[PDB]
Design an enzyme around this catalytic site. Structure first.
Site, PDB file in Angstrom:
ATOM      1  N   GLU A  54     -55.864 -73.922  39.047  1.00 51.85           N
ATOM      2  CA  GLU A  54     -56.458 -75.149  39.607  1.00 51.85           C
ATOM      3  C   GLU A  54     -56.805 -75.020  41.093  1.00 51.85           C
ATOM      4  OE1 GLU A  54     -53.985 -78.519  38.452  1.00 51.85           O
ATOM      5  OE2 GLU A  54     -54.066 -77.909  36.323  1.00 51.85           O
ATOM      6  N   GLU A  66     -54.039 -74.658  27.048  1.00 46.37           N
ATOM      7  CA  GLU A  66     -53.255 -75.899  27.050  1.00 46.37           C
ATOM      8  C   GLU A  66     -53.891 -76.937  26.151  1.00 46.37           C
ATOM      9  OE1 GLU A  66     -52.242 -77.141  31.081  1.00 46.37           O
ATOM     10  OE2 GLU A  66     -52.065 -75.057  31.754  1.00 46.37           O
TER      11      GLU A  66
END
Length: 339
Positions: free
Chosen positions: A143, A251
């Site tokens: 991220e 995920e």
């Protein structure tokens, strides 16, 4: 009232010629006999849901460097190794899951660029080194992109102190610590075109200059309405065009709600469970076209009441393949059908 079925098709076996099928689990699952058996029936990769993040492995600091707490993480890695399954490492570098003291010296003063880069090298060498040979894939940087910034870089403390070079250096150092691990850049919102473009260019530019990045992780925290499977496919096509880059879907989960919606259900609406099943079938049919590059697909939870989305959004949700009682959902049968 548990209703696990030990005889239905194994997810990973159904995809054995396509890609690994993984699950994220918290530590409590490793000491629950039903959870352990269900993990090993269906999955040939695990990810520690939280127990390998920086805040989890860091115990503190002194004037000479970092202190660690590895007992729980060791249980995860040992569980994977002794059961002949993979463990993905989540995650070495992440703005939102590191304690503030990590970015300061022992006196409480913000670290300089040189001192923070030195600490990053120490952290990666220590953590990747401890598990050398045992963790097949690491999410090295998580991220780091923010598409609202003109240059695309998230203005985290990492970036504010180091500039963007913390990203490439994390990969260099992780590869030195375990040259056989596959190293990933992991992110969400890969189907926002502007963000996809920033991710693509960042990874491509790292790879072209010899940085040992081996893959892109697409989190794929999606919902029944967005993004489309075709947009996910667009991401795979672009990222897979970089030579030497593989893809893990890291995920995966599929909320029954639109993002930012005030709908709130006490029990799962069957029409939405069916849309979920249809979309999971579509998704896996598409992923099977890309097994040359997509090598692992991990679901972010074992069963619906374990989903992080319930706490995160403060409401019940049904994002996964098994219900609260361990029984198979329409989504499970859809994923089996797509295989």
């Amino acid at each position: 009232d548990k209703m696990p079925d030990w005889n239905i098709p194994s997810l990973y076996e159904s995809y054995k010629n396509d890609f690994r099928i993984g699950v994220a689990i918290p530590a409590k699952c490793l000491s629950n006999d039903t959870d352990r058996r269900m993990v090993l029936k269906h999955f040939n990769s695990i990810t520690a849901e939280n127990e390998m993040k920086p805040e989890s492995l860091l115990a503190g600091q002194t004037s000479t460097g970092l202190n660690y707490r590895f007992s729980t993480a060791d249980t995860f890695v040992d569980f994977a190794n002794t059961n002949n399954i993979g463990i993905r490492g989540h995650t070495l570098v992440w703005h939102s899951q590191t304690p503030d003291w990590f970015f300061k010296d022992s006196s409480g003063q913000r670290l300089t660029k040189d001192a923070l880069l030195a600490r990053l090298k120490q952290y990666i060498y220590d953590v990747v080194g401890r598990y050398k040979g045992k963790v097949y894939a690491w999410d090295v940087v998580n991220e780091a992109i923010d598409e609202n910034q003109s240059d695309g870089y998230r203005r985290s403390t990492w970036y504010e102190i180091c500039g963007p070079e913390y990203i490439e250096k994390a990969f260099i150092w992780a590869h030195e610590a375990d040259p056989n691990a596959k190293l990933f850049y992991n992110d969400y919102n890969t189907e926002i075109s502007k963000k996809r473009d920033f991710i693509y260019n960042m990874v491509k530019n790292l790879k072209s200059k010899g940085i040992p990045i081996h893959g892109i992780g697409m989190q794929c925290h999606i919902n029944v309405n967005w993004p489309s499977v075709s947009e996910i496919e667009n991401s795979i096509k672009l990222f897979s065009s970089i030579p030497g880059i593989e893809i893990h879907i890291t995920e995966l989960d599929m909320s029954l709600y639109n993002y930012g919606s005030s709908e709130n259900y006490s029990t799962p609406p069957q029409d939405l469970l069916q849309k979920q099943a249809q979309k999971y079938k579509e998704l896996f049919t598409m992923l099977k076209k890309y097994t040359n590059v997509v090598k692992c697909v991990t679901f972010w939870g074992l069963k619906d009441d374990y989903s992080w989305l319930r706490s995160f959004n403060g409401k019940n949700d049904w994002p996964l393949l098994l219900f609260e009682d361990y029984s198979a959902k329409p989504a499970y049968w859809a994923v089996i059908e797509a295989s």
